Amino acid sequence: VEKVFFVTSPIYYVNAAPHIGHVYSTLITDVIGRYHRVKGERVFALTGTDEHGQKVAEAAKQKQVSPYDFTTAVAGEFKKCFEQMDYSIDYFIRTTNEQHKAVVKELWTKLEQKGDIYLGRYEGWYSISDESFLTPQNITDGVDKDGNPCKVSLESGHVVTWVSEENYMFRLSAFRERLLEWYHANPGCIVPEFRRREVIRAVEKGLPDLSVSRARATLHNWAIPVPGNPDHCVYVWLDALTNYLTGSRLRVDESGKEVSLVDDFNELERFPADVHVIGKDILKFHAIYWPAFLLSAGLPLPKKIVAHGWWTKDRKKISLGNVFDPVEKAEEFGYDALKYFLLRESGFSDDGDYSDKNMIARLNGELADTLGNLVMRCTSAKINVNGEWPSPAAYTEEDESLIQLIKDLPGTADHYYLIPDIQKAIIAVFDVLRAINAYVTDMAPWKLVKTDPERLRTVLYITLEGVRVTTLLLSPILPRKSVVIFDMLGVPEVHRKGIENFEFGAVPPGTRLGPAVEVLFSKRST
Ligand code: MET
């Protein structure tokens, strides 16, 4: 299937201001999207805001403003944040959008017609902060804003409350076997692997039916009405998850505004998602509820769900006196640099840790000393006297060993990007960058200028090509810096994307370097 590559971030609750968690998830989404665009594919990358529900409406009430005003303002803050972070997301969806609501109603009605929605009761615990139903085994004792003895979620630590309401119920229990079939037939559909195992374990134990409506009073009437029953509202999570289906169906203009909802998702060739990027905290909603809904509706399932960890700063919980502002740190250290760090410092299996110390260490060691150094050396007037890509002479075995690494890199990085495992992709590229540096050091091209100009041609060419290829594969990570690098190397635009240009030798000898003006990454004081 030649289709539009469709990658999503979660849609974020607007109870609070954008923070590192949201920036991180959307970064991952952005990177995946960028890699598929550099690969030459059609791409649609989606992010946005989750605007209905009890949680949001209570947040509005606390700020003493209407839910409508509150959500529009906070959505505005999210949009500004993502603009500032220099992402390349194709559309920003809001669940208050009228087209989204129409899709929610269609999906609901499809589920109901299928016989998978019935009128029942939920009597049990509920975390308003996670909009999550919990069993008694997932709660325990704790404290609230006052410090009174309450119940809290084992998962999140947020206060839970007992709910007893007549609710539309979705027959989730009936989907156990089909979900297990899906997990097992598609053993790469959840990443990383240990999270896939967690999901399978949970579904094996059995599934209860799921409340998909709430009484309108409970949600302060801030939600989508149930079709044919105005006394009930659609569960915020059914509403929310449906964003991916809505997004897959919106025609978007040049300015990024939604102009049309298509009837059939196939018309835009996006659904279902190739990658849903999420935090570990919402895995059950995406790997269990979502596919069950899609199975009921007869809709295709997503290819991959990738679930990441949470950040800490200085080994401590990120208000409490430990702020981590990504815009602030990007202004201090550089946007590409901070992005690189977030993506390199930890894998999707880990809870990453930020500190200025280790940020500087990676900036200086990897970006400046390994990458930047190499870029300056091969473009330097001292070494590259003609300011061009030279024509190589005959290759030694040592030359061939480096060339082989450069040739193998795209295939290796490609597999990692598709997992997806961006950390391993970065590490693979930097392994090759370190080898190129070692080669340059062994060959001492600065001496060759006077001693053996023929040999220098060969060394310089291989080095330039290694820098081009590594930089191409790093361009989704360092989108702005990659352009600077290509400009220094004089790589024509046509050669900055497309799988054809993953091949060693794509830029011909005689190509002129860009003019000199200057540092790529400036090292910071320890
Ligand atoms: C369908 S993605 C919804 C994510 C949810 N709003 C959250 O912030 O946790």
Side-chain angles (χ1 to χ4, degrees), residues 2-60 62 65-79 81-100 102-144 146-253 255-256 258-314 317-319 321-376 378-449 451-517 519-526:
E2 167 49 56
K3 68 185 286 299
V4 178
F5 192 83
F6 182 26
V7 57
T8 73
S9 78
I11 51 164
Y12 308 112
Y13 285 133
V14 298
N15 61 315
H19 56 55
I20 187 64
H22 314 122
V23 169
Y24 181 49
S25 288
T26 300
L27 175 56
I28 293 168
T29 295
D30 191 46
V31 165
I32 290 173
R34 287 175 182 279
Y35 176 68
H36 291 266
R37 284 194 214 90
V38 317
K39 210 175 162 172
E41 294 159 6
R42 294 179 292 168
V43 172
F44 189 79
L46 185 67
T47 192
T49 47
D50 193 345
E51 294 186 8
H52 295 124
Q54 186 162 8
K55 188 178 167 68
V56 168
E58 287 174 356
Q62 282 296 295
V65 65
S66 81
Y68 299 89
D69 287 328
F70 185 78
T71 61
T72 299
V74 175
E77 291 171 42
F78 273 78
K79 287 184 169 178
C81 179
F82 296 171
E83 286 165 31
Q84 195 61 62
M85 288 291 311
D86 199 8
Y87 294 147
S88 189
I89 304 297
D90 297 286
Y91 186 73
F92 191 109
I93 188 165
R94 300 179 55 201
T95 60
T96 49
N97 185 278
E98 193 73 7
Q99 285 52 81
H100 175 72
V103 175
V104 171
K105 290 165 162 149
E106 282 178 28
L107 181 55
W108 180 280
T109 296
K110 189 73 184 205
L111 303 175
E112 196 281 328
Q113 285 171 346
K114 187 79 180 174
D116 288 327
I117 295 184
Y118 69 99
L119 185 57
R121 291 189 76 73
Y122 182 79
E123 304 189 351
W125 296 100
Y126 192 71
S127 174
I128 289 164
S129 173
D130 310 302
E131 300 287 12
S132 186
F133 297 101
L134 298 169
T135 65
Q137 300 72 41
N138 281 124
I139 66 155
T140 187
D141 302 283
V143 286
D144 45 9
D146 293 308
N148 266 313
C150 71
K151 300 298 188 178
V152 298
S153 172
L154 268 172
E155 301 170 342
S156 75
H158 285 283
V159 173
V160 294
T161 41
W162 184 269
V163 167
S164 184
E165 296 178 6
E166 185 170 278
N167 276 184
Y168 285 103
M169 300 293 295
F170 173 75
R171 303 180 189 269
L172 181 59
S173 60
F175 287 93
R176 178 176 172 281
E177 293 174 74
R178 281 170 287 181
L179 287 171
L180 294 173
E181 277 167 358
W182 177 62
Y183 305 139
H184 285 85
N186 304 277
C189 72
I190 295 162
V191 175
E193 178 64 11
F194 80 92
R195 301 211 153 104
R196 187 185 152 250
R197 289 197 303 274
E198 284 169 12
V199 170
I200 295 172
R201 258 185 288 247
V203 177
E204 293 265 15
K205 287 185 208 285
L207 291 175
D209 287 352
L210 175 69
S211 173
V212 289
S213 85
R214 300 295 296 284
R216 71 185 187 94
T218 312
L219 285 38
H220 312 286
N221 299 287
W222 189 245
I224 298 165
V226 169
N229 196 329
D231 293 330
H232 290 253
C233 315
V234 177
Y235 184 18
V236 65
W237 272 100
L238 179 42
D239 172 359
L241 288 160
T242 302
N243 93 87
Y244 304 129
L245 180 53
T246 303
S248 79
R249 287 174 52 189
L250 296 171
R251 287 200 186 265
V252 187
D253 65 19
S255 76
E258 164 265 311
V259 295
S260 179
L261 179 69
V262 303
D263 292 314
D264 178 11
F265 67 82
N266 288 298
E267 194 177 312
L268 303 183
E269 311 171 80
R270 297 173 194 159
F271 206 76
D274 295 286
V275 178
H276 287 304
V277 179
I278 65 175
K280 67 185 166 174
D281 56 318
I282 63 186
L283 185 54
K284 92 188 174 171
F285 307 101
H286 288 82
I288 307 184
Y289 304 160
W290 178 225
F293 298 144
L294 299 174
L295 283 170
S296 174
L299 287 170
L301 297 210
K303 302 299 162 209
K304 293 176 202 286
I305 300 162
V306 64
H308 61 75
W310 300 338
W311 283 94
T312 52
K313 182 164 188 295
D314 304 314
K317 175 79 271 210
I318 296 161
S319 176
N322 189 27
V323 171
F324 180 21
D325 183 339
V327 177
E328 186 167 305
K329 293 299 192 186
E331 291 294 321
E332 183 165 12
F333 296 108
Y335 281 82
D336 287 21
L338 178 56
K339 286 167 172 181
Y340 170 96
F341 178 87
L342 289 171
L343 295 170
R344 173 62 180 83
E345 174 56 16
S346 162
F348 299 153
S349 70
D350 306 299
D351 294 344
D353 182 55
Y354 175 91
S355 63
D356 288 341
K357 194 181 190 256
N358 201 34
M359 173 64 188
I360 289 163
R362 287 204 185 281
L363 167 56
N364 294 348
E366 289 136 29
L367 300 180
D369 277 3
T370 297
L371 171 55
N373 178 253
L374 192 54
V375 173
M376 302 309 277
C378 69
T379 59
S380 154
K382 188 120 180 295
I383 289 155
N384 191 330
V385 308
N386 297 326
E388 77 176 18
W389 286 60
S391 185
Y395 293 135
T396 68
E397 267 300 323
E398 183 158 354
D399 296 336
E400 298 263 31
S401 76
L402 183 54
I403 289 164
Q404 191 63 252
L405 296 175
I406 295 166
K407 280 180 173 175
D408 294 355
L409 180 54
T412 286
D414 182 67
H415 285 305
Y416 289 132
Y417 271 116
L418 292 168
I419 281 168
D421 187 331
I422 295 160
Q423 193 189 41
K424 288 201 211 328
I426 292 167
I427 295 174
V429 173
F430 270 76
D431 280 351
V432 174
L433 287 172
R434 282 189 286 278
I436 297 162
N437 271 291
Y439 170 79
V440 166
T441 292
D442 278 317
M443 297 298 133
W446 51 92
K447 301 180 181 180
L448 298 179
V449 169
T451 271
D452 193 340
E454 196 197 56
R455 184 73 185 122
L456 177 61
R457 291 203 269 111
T458 308
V459 171
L460 196 47
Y461 172 83
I462 290 169
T463 302
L464 288 162
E465 179 62 0
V467 170
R468 183 185 73 80
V469 172
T470 48
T471 300
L472 186 50
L473 292 159
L474 285 177
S475 62
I477 311 305
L478 314 163
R480 297 297 179 183
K481 299 293 178 183
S482 63
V483 169
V484 175
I485 289 168
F486 287 140
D487 285 356
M488 292 176 178
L489 271 46
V491 179
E493 267 302 306
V494 69
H495 291 299
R496 299 178 191 203
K497 65 166 287 171
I499 65 176
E500 305 88 343
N501 294 298
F502 289 14
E503 287 159 24
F504 185 91
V507 171
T511 305
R512 220 144 303 180
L513 290 186
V517 73
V519 279
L520 205 92
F521 293 102
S522 65
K523 300 178 81 176
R524 301 292 192 286
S525 174
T526 305

